UniProtKB/Swiss-Prot annotation:
The keyword Signal applies. It holds the Pfam family Stap_Strp_toxin. Mitogenic for human peripheral blood lymphocytes. Its main location: secreted. Gene3D superfamilies: 2.40.50.110, 3.10.20.120. It is found in: Secreted. GO terms for cellular component: extracellular region. InterPro entries: Enterotoxin (IPR008992), Staph/Strept_toxin_CS (IPR006126), Staph_tox_OB (IPR006173), SuperAg_toxin_C (IPR016091), Superantigen_bac (IPR013307), Toxin_b-grasp_Staph/Strep (IPR006123). It comes from Streptococcus pyogenes. Belongs to the staphylococcal/streptococcal toxin family. This is Exotoxin type H. The keyword RNA-binding does not apply. The gene is speH. PROSITE patterns: STAPH_STREP_TOXIN_2.
Length: 204
């Protein structure tokens, strides 16, 4: 069920510690040899492999300066670590780093809550960036993944777009139990206009 302590613990650990988060501005990919569903980057001192769902997404960022905002998992192999993998999280760089406050509407066990917000400075952001910033907020404010009282067990993060298209994320999706399994959902690298949507969260 959604009351599995291990999974809740790993899901929380994944979104709580910034250690797992890879944030880099105006970066360009390494001229390495890659497949058609990935792009190798060198962020900080780590080697990062960014995977995408479709093969046409790669071509769009190749040798172009991009902004990265994605969660990552350590790839385990018989070599000197430093190998990390992430899904999506890429958008072309931008000179308009202006601040945008995305309204976050939380329904806490049926009760409407006071207006909350998350900030982003890209005019076009990825769903993943929004989902990450929201979950960090819910963890801090409501402790939705707690393993002592386990007050919460169901919830959804809904990106309510003005274009009649909704992106839904289940706050209690554990994949198979591994981080890459939990992060694969962001592989579509879907992006959206920062000012054309708001967030609706339901937790119980
Ligand atoms: Zn709405
Ligand atoms: Zn709508």
């Amino acid at each position: 069920n959604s009351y599995n302590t291990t999974n809740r613990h790993n899901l929380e650990s994944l979104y709580k510690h910034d250690s797992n988060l890879i944030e880099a501005d105006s970066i360009k990919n390494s001229p390495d040899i890659v497949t058609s569903h990935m792009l190798k980057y060198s962020v900080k001192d780590k080697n990062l492999s960014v995977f995408f769902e479709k093969d046409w997404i790669s071509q769009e960022f190749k040798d172009k300066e991009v902004d990265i905002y994605a969660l990552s998992a350590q790839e385990v192999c018989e070599c000197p670590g430093k190998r990390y993998e992430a899904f999506g999280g890429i958008t072309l760089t931008n000179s308009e780093k202006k601040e945008i406050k995305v309204p976050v509407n939380v329904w806490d066990k049926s009760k409407q809550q006071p207006p909350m917000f998350i900030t982003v400075n890209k005019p076009k952001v990825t769903a993943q960036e929004v989902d990450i910033k929201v979950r960090k907020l819910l963890i801090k404010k409501y402790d939705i993944y707690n393993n002592r009282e386990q007050k919460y067990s169901k919830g959804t993060v809904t990106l309510d777009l003005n274009s009649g298209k909704d992106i839904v994320f289940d706050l209690y999706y554990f994949g198979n139990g591994d981080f890459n399994s939990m992060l694969k959902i962001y592989s579509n690298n879907e992006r959206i206009d920062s000012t054309q949507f708001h967030v609706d969260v339901s937790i119980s």
